[PDB]
Structure 1
Amino acid sequence: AGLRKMAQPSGVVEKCIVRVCYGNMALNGLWLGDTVMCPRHVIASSTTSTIDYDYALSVLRLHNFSISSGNVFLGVVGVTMRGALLQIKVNQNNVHTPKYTYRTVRPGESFNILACYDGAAAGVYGVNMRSNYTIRGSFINGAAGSPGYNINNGTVEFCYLHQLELGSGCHVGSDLDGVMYGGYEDQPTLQVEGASSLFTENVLAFLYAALINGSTWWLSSSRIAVDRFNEWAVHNGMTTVVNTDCFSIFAAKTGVDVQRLLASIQSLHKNFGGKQILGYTSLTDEFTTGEVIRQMYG
């Protein structure tokens, strides 16, 4: 009984973190096979004016790179641009390379952040991609290159390398092909995050997780129609609901239908914060259905 925003174990990912230095810039890289990936602004000079990354690569000296795993430095064979990342060929294989894939995540999906500094893992936590493609993270200067990941069937699924902070805990990374999430630029210029809406699908996963754990003080007796709730959601900063069949697994375990939970959501929005649900803010949208099931039953 209970529910916690958990992080999948980090050990397989820890062995792939390297320190990447260039000039007076140092950040984190991901070492898989004989390639290190890392944000391309490690080669940037100015940190307030637009950066011509292509010119920076044109004048790059490979010996100016200093790449280390623990106390062991690697020889740099080549560099190539990969969107907002650099792909750095190194002269040695990482013998601890896990089995892995790349996958881009979409808004509302959960993954794990391994926050790294100076090529070393310092903490691990779970995040959920917000509707404006930022994550509610905890990063200070030096965290760039921190990997996001999910573990599925012995396979590490890399989805995120940290790039920048827009404001507050609004953090922005790229996927592993170098595409920035949300389209934000890796330029030190003035950009604003879009608005963000609560993922109603995620709130429902959380509410079902509450029911399975015996928390029922919030559960309406009356139901509300999907369309009625949708009309309300768009004026109350929550996303609309398309299909209720994705919650079939929870219907089959609680007897409770989504329409009762949508009525509870509106009443919880009416007295927002009057009581916690499982020690969490009611209407927390950081839990997905998969997370809930994986945590609750397995």
Structure 2
Amino acid sequence: AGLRKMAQPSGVVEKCIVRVCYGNMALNGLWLGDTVMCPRHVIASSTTSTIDYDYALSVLRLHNFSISSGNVFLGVVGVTMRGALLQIKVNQNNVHTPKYTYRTVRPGESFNILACYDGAAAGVYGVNMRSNYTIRGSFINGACGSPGYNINNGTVEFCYLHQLELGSGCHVGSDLDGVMYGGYEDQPTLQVEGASSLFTENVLAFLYAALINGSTWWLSSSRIAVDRFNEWAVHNGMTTVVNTDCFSILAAKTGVDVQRLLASIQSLHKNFGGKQILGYTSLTDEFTTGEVIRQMYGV
């Protein structure tokens, strides 16, 4: 019993973290095979104005990099621009490289953050990509380059490298192709986050978890159809429901259909805060159907 937001174990990723320094900047990189990937703002000069990154690369000198795995320093052979990342070729292969892939995550999907400082892992926690392509992380100065990952059947799927914090305190990365999530710029100029909405398909998963754990006080007797709910959602800070086949096994185990949970969601919006669900805010959207099925029933 219980429901907790968990991270997948971090050991296989920990041995891939390096410290990457250039000039006055220091952040983290991801060392796989004979390449280190890191946010390109490590080569930028200090300025609140816009950075011409092609110019910064044109004046770069390879001997000004300092890249280290612990107290072992890696020699730099070359550098390539990769979107908002640098691909740095080094003279040593990481013998602890796991089997890995890259994958760009989509809104509402969960993954794991390995928060790193000075080229070493400090903390690990699960996150969920919001509708405005930000995550609700915890990062302070020095965290850039911290990776996000999922572990799928022995292969590490890398999906995020940390890049910046917005004025609201939420967090933005790029994928490992160098594409910034949400299209935000890797620039120091002021940008404000897009509007954020609760991810309704994840709220549905959370409410099924609550039923399985014996929480029913919030359950409506009424029903509302998916498309009518979706019309209400986009005026009330919630995302539309697109996928429902994923709920079939949860509806079968609990005896409760999606239309009943959608009506419950509308009512919870009306006395919002009056009571928690399993000790959480009643409209919690950080859990996916997959995470719930794993925690309730196993892998």
Residue 215 of structure 1 and its aligned partner are, at CA, apart by 1.1
SS at match of 1:51: coil
Give the stretch that moved more between structures: 223-232 or 56-65. 223-232
Instruction: Supply the distance in 1 between the matched residues of 2:47 and 2:124 (Cα, whole angstroms).
Output: 28
Does the 8 Å contact 1:104/1:159 carry over to 2?
yes
Give the alignment's TM-score, normalised by structure 2.
0.98
Give the stretch that moved more between structures: 219-228 or 189-198. 219-228
SS at match of 2:269: helix
Instruction: Supply the distance in 1 between the matched residues of 2:41 and 2:242 (Cα, whole angstroms).
Output: 40
Residue 47 of structure 1 and its aligned partner are, at CA, apart by 3.2
Does the 8 Å contact 2:113/2:125 carry over to 1?
yes
Instruction: Supply the distance in 1 between the matched residues of 2:28 and 2:231 (Cα, whole angstroms).
Output: 45
Structure 1: 5+ residue stretches without partners: none
Task: Render the CA deviation track for 1:202-225: whole Å, top value 9, x for unaligned.
Answer: 100000011111111111122222
Give the alignment's TM-score, normalised by structure 1.
0.98
Task: Render the CA deviation track for 1:127-163: whole Å, top value 9, x for unaligned.
Answer: 1111110101111111000000001101100000000
Does the 8 Å contact 1:19/1:119 carry over to 2?
yes
How many matched pairs?
298
SS at match of 1:135: coil
C-alpha root-mean-square deviation of aligned residues, in Å?
A: 0.9
Residue 169 of structure 1 and its aligned partner are, at CA, apart by 2.8
SS at match of 1:276: coil
Task: Render the CA deviation track for 1:155-198: whole Å, top value 9, x for unaligned.
Answer: 10000000000123310000000000001111111211110111
Q: Kindly report structure 1 stretches of 4+ aligned residues shifted beyond 6 Å.
A: none
Residue 242 of structure 1 and its aligned partner are, at CA, apart by 2.8
Task: Render the CA deviation track for 1:11-68: whole Å, top value 9, x for unaligned.
Answer: 1100000000000100000000000000000000023111111111111111100000
Task: Render the CA deviation track for 1:88-120: whole Å, top value 9, x for unaligned.
Answer: 001001100011000000111000000000001
Residue 231 of structure 1 and its aligned partner are, at CA, apart by 2.4
2:101 maps to what in 1?
A: 101
Does the 8 Å contact 1:135/1:169 carry over to 2?
no
Identity of aligned residues (%): 99
Task: Render the CA deviation track for 1:222-258: whole Å, top value 9, x for unaligned.
Answer: 2222233222212211112234222112112111100
Task: Render the CA deviation track for 1:253-286: whole Å, top value 9, x for unaligned.
Answer: 1111001100110111100011111111011111
SS at match of 1:167: coil
Structure 2: 5+ residue stretches without partners: none
Instruction: Supply the distance in 2 between the matched residues of 1:226 and 1:107 (Cα, whole angstroms).
Output: 19
SS at match of 1:20: strand
SS at match of 1:113: strand
Does the 8 Å contact 1:33/1:93 carry over to 2?
yes
Does the 8 Å contact 1:202/1:285 carry over to 2?
yes
